[PDB]
Each structure stands twice: as structure tokens, then as C-alpha cells.
Design a protein around this ligand. Sequence first.
Ligand code: NAP
Ligand code: FOL
Length: 159
Amino acid sequence: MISLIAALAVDRVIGMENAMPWNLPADLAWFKRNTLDKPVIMGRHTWESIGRPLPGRKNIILSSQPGTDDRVTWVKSVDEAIAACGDVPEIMVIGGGRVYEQFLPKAQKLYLTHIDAEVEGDTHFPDYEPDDWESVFSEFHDADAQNSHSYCFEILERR
Ligand SMILES: NC(=O)c1ccc[n+]([C@@H]2O[C@H](COP(=O)([O-])OP(=O)(O)OC[C@H]3O[C@@H](n4cnc5c(N)ncnc54)[C@H](OP(=O)(O)O)[C@@H]3O)[C@@H](O)[C@H]2O)c1
Ligand SMILES: Nc1nc(=O)c2nc(CNc3ccc(C(=O)N[C@@H](CCC(=O)O)C(=O)O)cc3)cnc2[nH]1
């Protein structure tokens, strides 16, 4: 099955000028936890934003153009991206905006972090129909010395 994982600020903002402006180490730890040892699918802009392969994961990059780095797998379509994952229980789609839009209709699970921060951004998580999704896990955390905003981890399953 296909899952999406994302961190959303207020108004579903996920990025600004090809970057993620906040720093929330608790949330990056959650991301690592939930993606380690799974294939991760990302768009080319997100690959450039991360800037290097994610270790311990098969990194699959969607681009219409040929690949420029053989440390990762390059594919030209959604169907090719899925096929390159092989027969695994869970495929993690890690964005960005355009890639999330394409995989949302196929996804069975959403791993969402809601961050209490207002960021003037240019990229948004897709508008999802809330009736289609059941919350199966929710955990709220106040800000602390390491994490300057409060945040909520949620896992939603398609009903
Ligand atoms: N907060 C979060 O959870 C989170 C997560 C991920 C990313 N982000 C942010 O999101 C932003 C990047 O998002 P974005 O929407 O601009 O870009 P994106 O979705 O990362 O990448 C878009 C690119 O991927 C390729 N692509 C997408 N679908 C394709 C298809 N079906 N076939 C072939 N190629 C395809 C194209 O590359 P070519 O142009 O090479 O064809 C396209 O230009 C950044 O600000 C990043 O920091 C935030
Ligand atoms: N919940 C969530 N938070 C995010 O920040 C996030 N970011 C992306 C895309 N961008 C990034 C940027 C950096 C790293 C990163 O450096 N991760 C290391 C963290 C090591 C750690 O903090 O433990 C990794 O190994 O996963 C991952 C994804 C996709 N989904 C997300 N999902």
C-alpha cells in the first residue's frame, strides 16, 4: 500500500522557495522512524531541497528528465515509481506538492504532522476530503527547548 507523510504548517503550507523554513527535530525523528527501511518516492524539487540521499531507504526520484546521480533511482511516471519499489508492504511518498497531489488518490494512509506555526509559503498539501479518512493515532506535544512550536502527530487511514 501507498502512504503519504508530510509536515503541514497553518493553512496546509509545506514549503517556501524550495525549503522548509522551520526546525523541529522531534518531527524529523518521527519522519525517520516511519520511513526507515522503506522505499521513499519524491519529486525532483524535493530531492534538490534535501540535497543528498536518505540513508537506509531506497530513494526513488520522479523526473521527466534523465537522472543526474546514480546513488538514487530515477523514474519517469507514477506507475514506474511504484514498480521500482518492488513488492514491499508499504511505500512512503515524501512529497512535494505536485507529487502528493498525484499519489493521494492511491494512498491508504496519511502520516501528518500539524505544526502550530504561520509560514508564508508557496507550496500546499492537497486539499483532502475529510470524510474519506479516519484518525487512528493522534499525539500532541507542546513546544520545548528543542522544538519551538507545538505539533500534533496524526495517522489517518482511508475509510
Ligand atoms: N513539509 C513537508 O512535508 C514537505 C515534504 C516535501 C516537500 N516539501 C516542500 O515542497 C516543495 C517542493 O514541492 P513541489 O510541488 O515544488 O515539487 P515536487 O513535487 O517535489 O517536484 C516536482 C517535480 O517532480 C517531477 N514530477 C512530478 N510528478 C511527475 C510525473 N508524474 N512524471 C515525471 N516527473 C514528475 C517533475 O520534475 P521535472 O521538472 O524534472 O520533470 C516536477 O517538476 C519544497 O518547498 C519542499 O521543501 C515539504
Ligand atoms: N513529517 C515530516 N516532516 C518533514 O520535515 C518532512 N520532510 C520531507 C521532505 N524533506 C526532508 C528534509 C530533510 C530530511 C532529513 O534530513 N531527514 C533525516 C533526519 C535525521 C533525524 O533527524 O533523525 C533522515 O534520516 O530521515 C528528510 C526530509 C518529507 N516529509 C516530511 N514529513
